[PDB]
mmCIF file of C-alpha atoms in Angstrom:
data_model
loop_
_atom_site.group_PDB
_atom_site.id
_atom_site.type_symbol
_atom_site.label_atom_id
_atom_site.label_comp_id
_atom_site.label_asym_id
_atom_site.label_seq_id
_atom_site.Cartn_x
_atom_site.Cartn_y
_atom_site.Cartn_z
ATOM 1 C CA UNK A 1 24.099 -12.196 -131.652
ATOM 2 C CA UNK A 2 20.910 -11.904 -133.740
ATOM 3 C CA UNK A 3 21.115 -10.416 -137.240
ATOM 4 C CA UNK A 4 19.899 -6.854 -137.654
ATOM 5 C CA UNK A 5 17.171 -8.276 -139.902
ATOM 6 C CA UNK A 6 16.029 -10.681 -137.138
ATOM 7 C CA UNK A 7 15.840 -7.769 -134.680
ATOM 8 C CA UNK A 8 14.047 -5.303 -137.014
ATOM 9 C CA UNK A 9 11.493 -7.948 -138.020
ATOM 10 C CA UNK A 10 10.655 -8.899 -134.422
ATOM 11 C CA UNK A 11 10.457 -5.307 -133.118
ATOM 12 C CA UNK A 12 8.387 -4.305 -136.134
ATOM 13 C CA UNK A 13 5.847 -7.029 -135.374
ATOM 14 C CA UNK A 14 5.752 -6.008 -131.719
ATOM 15 C CA UNK A 15 5.266 -2.339 -132.598
ATOM 16 C CA UNK A 16 2.518 -3.117 -135.138
ATOM 17 C CA UNK A 17 0.797 -5.703 -132.960
ATOM 18 C CA UNK A 18 0.914 -3.652 -129.762
ATOM 19 C CA UNK A 19 0.717 -0.171 -131.371
ATOM 20 C CA UNK A 20 3.648 1.104 -129.292
ATOM 21 C CA UNK A 21 7.397 1.671 -129.460
ATOM 22 C CA UNK A 22 9.216 -1.665 -129.194
ATOM 23 C CA UNK A 23 12.896 -1.683 -128.317
ATOM 24 C CA UNK A 24 15.750 -4.074 -127.736
ATOM 25 C CA UNK A 25 19.008 -3.475 -125.900
ATOM 26 C CA UNK A 26 21.562 -4.632 -128.413
ATOM 27 C CA UNK A 27 24.227 -7.072 -127.247
ATOM 28 C CA UNK A 28 27.451 -5.766 -128.786
ATOM 29 C CA UNK A 29 30.628 -7.536 -127.694
ATOM 30 C CA UNK A 30 32.767 -5.531 -125.268
ATOM 31 C CA UNK A 31 30.314 -2.680 -124.667
ATOM 32 C CA UNK A 32 29.960 -2.463 -120.898
ATOM 33 C CA UNK A 33 28.210 0.774 -119.858
ATOM 34 C CA UNK A 34 26.779 2.640 -122.807
ATOM 35 C CA UNK A 35 23.545 0.988 -123.940
ATOM 36 C CA UNK A 36 22.677 0.740 -127.616
ATOM 37 C CA UNK A 37 19.024 0.099 -128.587
ATOM 38 C CA UNK A 38 17.121 -0.564 -131.792
ATOM 39 C CA UNK A 39 13.590 0.880 -131.718
ATOM 40 C CA UNK A 40 10.500 0.182 -133.812
ATOM 41 C CA UNK A 41 8.468 3.386 -133.733
ATOM 42 C CA UNK A 42 4.914 3.538 -135.123
ATOM 43 C CA UNK A 43 4.278 6.780 -136.969
ATOM 44 C CA UNK A 44 1.894 8.000 -139.660
ATOM 45 C CA UNK A 45 0.346 4.512 -139.961
ATOM 46 C CA UNK A 46 3.666 2.711 -140.641
ATOM 47 C CA UNK A 47 6.716 1.508 -138.658
ATOM 48 C CA UNK A 48 9.939 3.541 -138.564
ATOM 49 C CA UNK A 49 13.239 2.311 -137.085
ATOM 50 C CA UNK A 50 15.852 4.166 -135.058
ATOM 51 C CA UNK A 51 19.063 3.423 -133.183
ATOM 52 C CA UNK A 52 19.738 5.147 -129.865
ATOM 53 C CA UNK A 53 22.446 5.257 -127.251
ATOM 54 C CA UNK A 54 21.811 5.558 -123.509
ATOM 55 C CA UNK A 55 23.531 4.951 -120.170
ATOM 56 C CA UNK A 56 22.520 1.900 -118.150
ATOM 57 C CA UNK A 57 21.582 4.512 -115.474
ATOM 58 C CA UNK A 58 18.914 6.570 -117.317
ATOM 59 C CA UNK A 59 17.277 5.401 -120.573
ATOM 60 C CA UNK A 60 15.120 8.513 -121.106
ATOM 61 C CA UNK A 61 18.312 10.480 -121.776
ATOM 62 C CA UNK A 62 19.330 9.394 -125.261
ATOM 63 C CA UNK A 63 20.846 10.332 -128.588
ATOM 64 C CA UNK A 64 19.603 8.924 -131.853
ATOM 65 C CA UNK A 65 22.551 7.746 -133.952
ATOM 66 C CA UNK A 66 23.309 6.592 -137.499
ATOM 67 C CA UNK A 67 26.469 5.339 -139.241
ATOM 68 C CA UNK A 68 27.147 8.941 -140.158
ATOM 69 C CA UNK A 69 27.870 9.545 -136.420
ATOM 70 C CA UNK A 70 30.733 7.011 -136.399
ATOM 71 C CA UNK A 71 33.491 9.597 -136.842
ATOM 72 C CA UNK A 72 32.075 11.901 -134.155
ATOM 73 C CA UNK A 73 32.052 8.994 -131.710
ATOM 74 C CA UNK A 74 35.700 8.158 -132.524
ATOM 75 C CA UNK A 75 36.767 11.810 -132.147
ATOM 76 C CA UNK A 76 35.100 11.926 -128.735
ATOM 77 C CA UNK A 77 36.856 8.696 -127.673
ATOM 78 C CA UNK A 78 40.143 10.195 -128.861
ATOM 79 C CA UNK A 79 39.546 13.352 -126.775
ATOM 80 C CA UNK A 80 38.726 11.240 -123.722
ATOM 81 C CA UNK A 81 41.891 9.199 -124.168
ATOM 82 C CA UNK A 82 44.046 12.291 -124.776
ATOM 83 C CA UNK A 83 42.929 13.916 -121.513
ATOM 84 C CA UNK A 84 42.012 10.837 -119.439
ATOM 85 C CA UNK A 85 44.910 11.061 -116.970
ATOM 86 C CA UNK A 86 44.583 14.817 -116.619
ATOM 87 C CA UNK A 87 40.855 14.818 -115.885
ATOM 88 C CA UNK A 88 40.970 11.841 -113.480
ATOM 89 C CA UNK A 89 43.743 13.622 -111.537
ATOM 90 C CA UNK A 90 42.581 17.234 -111.699
ATOM 91 C CA UNK A 91 38.802 17.026 -111.104
ATOM 92 C CA UNK A 92 36.402 15.064 -108.922
ATOM 93 C CA UNK A 93 33.540 13.777 -111.066
ATOM 94 C CA UNK A 94 30.027 13.478 -109.679
ATOM 95 C CA UNK B 1 45.527 21.487 -124.844
ATOM 96 C CA UNK B 2 45.831 20.622 -121.157
ATOM 97 C CA UNK B 3 46.764 24.188 -120.133
ATOM 98 C CA UNK B 4 43.618 25.608 -121.708
ATOM 99 C CA UNK B 5 41.407 22.851 -120.344
ATOM 100 C CA UNK B 6 42.759 23.516 -116.816
ATOM 101 C CA UNK B 7 41.824 27.188 -117.006
ATOM 102 C CA UNK B 8 38.396 26.385 -118.520
ATOM 103 C CA UNK B 9 37.747 23.985 -115.660
ATOM 104 C CA UNK B 10 38.690 26.587 -112.998
ATOM 105 C CA UNK B 11 36.655 29.343 -114.682
ATOM 106 C CA UNK B 12 33.621 27.075 -115.056
ATOM 107 C CA UNK B 13 33.793 26.286 -111.288
ATOM 108 C CA UNK B 14 34.032 30.012 -110.519
ATOM 109 C CA UNK B 15 30.930 30.682 -112.678
ATOM 110 C CA UNK B 16 28.985 27.872 -110.927
ATOM 111 C CA UNK B 17 29.926 29.216 -107.491
ATOM 112 C CA UNK B 18 29.167 32.856 -108.357
ATOM 113 C CA UNK B 19 25.914 32.224 -110.254
ATOM 114 C CA UNK B 20 24.680 29.486 -107.864
ATOM 115 C CA UNK B 21 24.065 27.080 -110.740
ATOM 116 C CA UNK B 22 25.409 24.350 -112.986
ATOM 117 C CA UNK B 23 27.730 26.023 -115.538
ATOM 118 C CA UNK B 24 28.636 24.326 -118.783
ATOM 119 C CA UNK B 25 31.116 24.714 -121.642
ATOM 120 C CA UNK B 26 31.212 22.883 -125.005
ATOM 121 C CA UNK B 27 34.657 21.378 -125.586
ATOM 122 C CA UNK B 28 36.561 22.397 -128.696
ATOM 123 C CA UNK B 29 37.075 19.100 -130.486
ATOM 124 C CA UNK B 30 38.259 19.477 -134.065
ATOM 125 C CA UNK B 31 36.239 17.716 -136.741
ATOM 126 C CA UNK B 32 32.948 17.136 -134.878
ATOM 127 C CA UNK B 33 29.881 17.334 -137.101
ATOM 128 C CA UNK B 34 26.937 16.805 -134.716
ATOM 129 C CA UNK B 35 27.596 15.195 -131.328
ATOM 130 C CA UNK B 36 29.492 17.548 -129.029
ATOM 131 C CA UNK B 37 31.064 17.126 -125.605
ATOM 132 C CA UNK B 38 30.042 19.420 -122.736
ATOM 133 C CA UNK B 39 31.859 19.884 -119.428
ATOM 134 C CA UNK B 40 29.617 20.782 -116.510
ATOM 135 C CA UNK B 41 30.548 22.358 -113.186
ATOM 136 C CA UNK B 42 27.965 21.046 -110.714
ATOM 137 C CA UNK B 43 27.666 22.663 -107.257
ATOM 138 C CA UNK B 44 27.172 20.170 -104.405
ATOM 139 C CA UNK B 45 27.026 21.754 -100.920
ATOM 140 C CA UNK B 46 29.939 24.188 -101.304
ATOM 141 C CA UNK B 47 32.026 21.872 -103.471
ATOM 142 C CA UNK B 48 32.183 21.841 -107.252
ATOM 143 C CA UNK B 49 32.189 18.448 -108.917
ATOM 144 C CA UNK B 50 32.365 17.943 -112.659
ATOM 145 C CA UNK B 51 30.479 15.909 -115.208
ATOM 146 C CA UNK B 52 30.678 15.388 -118.942
ATOM 147 C CA UNK B 53 27.729 14.950 -121.248
ATOM 148 C CA UNK B 54 27.477 14.385 -124.997
ATOM 149 C CA UNK B 55 24.668 16.108 -126.928
ATOM 150 C CA UNK B 56 23.156 16.463 -130.365
ATOM 151 C CA UNK B 57 24.005 20.000 -131.571
ATOM 152 C CA UNK B 58 20.533 20.225 -133.132
ATOM 153 C CA UNK B 59 18.818 19.401 -129.819
ATOM 154 C CA UNK B 60 20.782 19.589 -126.575
ATOM 155 C CA UNK B 61 18.112 17.645 -124.650
ATOM 156 C CA UNK B 62 19.240 14.633 -126.669
ATOM 157 C CA UNK B 63 22.192 13.720 -124.487
ATOM 158 C CA UNK B 64 23.897 11.099 -122.356
ATOM 159 C CA UNK B 65 26.410 11.285 -119.496
ATOM 160 C CA UNK B 66 29.978 10.046 -120.165
ATOM 161 C CA UNK B 67 33.396 9.712 -118.477
ATOM 162 C CA UNK B 68 36.956 9.140 -119.749
ATOM 163 C CA UNK B 69 36.436 5.422 -119.010
ATOM 164 C CA UNK B 70 33.809 5.237 -121.803
ATOM 165 C CA UNK B 71 36.351 5.598 -124.651
ATOM 166 C CA UNK B 72 36.287 1.859 -125.508
ATOM 167 C CA UNK B 73 32.451 1.755 -125.584
ATOM 168 C CA UNK B 74 32.412 4.698 -127.997
ATOM 169 C CA UNK B 75 34.980 3.058 -130.304
ATOM 170 C CA UNK B 76 32.990 -0.218 -130.276
ATOM 171 C CA UNK B 77 29.765 1.637 -131.138
ATOM 172 C CA UNK B 78 31.532 3.440 -134.000
ATOM 173 C CA UNK B 79 32.930 0.126 -135.257
ATOM 174 C CA UNK B 80 29.480 -1.513 -135.128
ATOM 175 C CA UNK B 81 27.988 1.396 -137.093
ATOM 176 C CA UNK B 82 30.769 1.038 -139.721
ATOM 177 C CA UNK B 83 30.449 -2.753 -140.031
ATOM 178 C CA UNK B 84 26.649 -2.640 -140.597
ATOM 179 C CA UNK B 85 26.486 0.797 -142.262
ATOM 180 C CA UNK B 86 24.835 -0.302 -145.508
ATOM 181 C CA UNK B 87 22.039 -2.256 -143.801
ATOM 182 C CA UNK B 88 21.509 0.382 -141.129
ATOM 183 C CA UNK B 89 21.351 3.278 -143.616
ATOM 184 C CA UNK B 90 18.792 1.434 -145.726
ATOM 185 C CA UNK B 91 16.581 0.026 -143.017
ATOM 186 C CA UNK B 92 16.918 2.598 -140.160
#
């Protein structure tokens, strides 16, 4: 896995050089469906960086995240685990 | 608890059937600050199927679809954010 610095630097150059958003799907060990991207976003004559999560089935639907979202993500995982058997048995998902 | 969630699920299906639309309810998860879970009752040709989506509370269009099987992915994302917190907070 590349360092966060190696990623930010490369995307920043791409964004500056191409004057567009440059993104990379992050390779995080064990993450199988949810996609995590780093984005270099040109704005106000400089480059800004963001981290976003997506499905592998629609990238335009996304949530921007920061370390401050860590607890929320864990609480959601805990909810899913708590009710996993119930939901899988009681409802048909689409 | 499960008993409440069961009733919420049935009532959400009823609403979707009666109002001819997707009906949604935000799940009551204690301690959430920003990213909330929504249950959706989705009509498909006289059957109700369900979906779950997570959203930013400050902008519900910012969302992704999830299932119970995604618990591990969410924990791994959280753990990544924790491990690299200092760098991310400074350079994001």
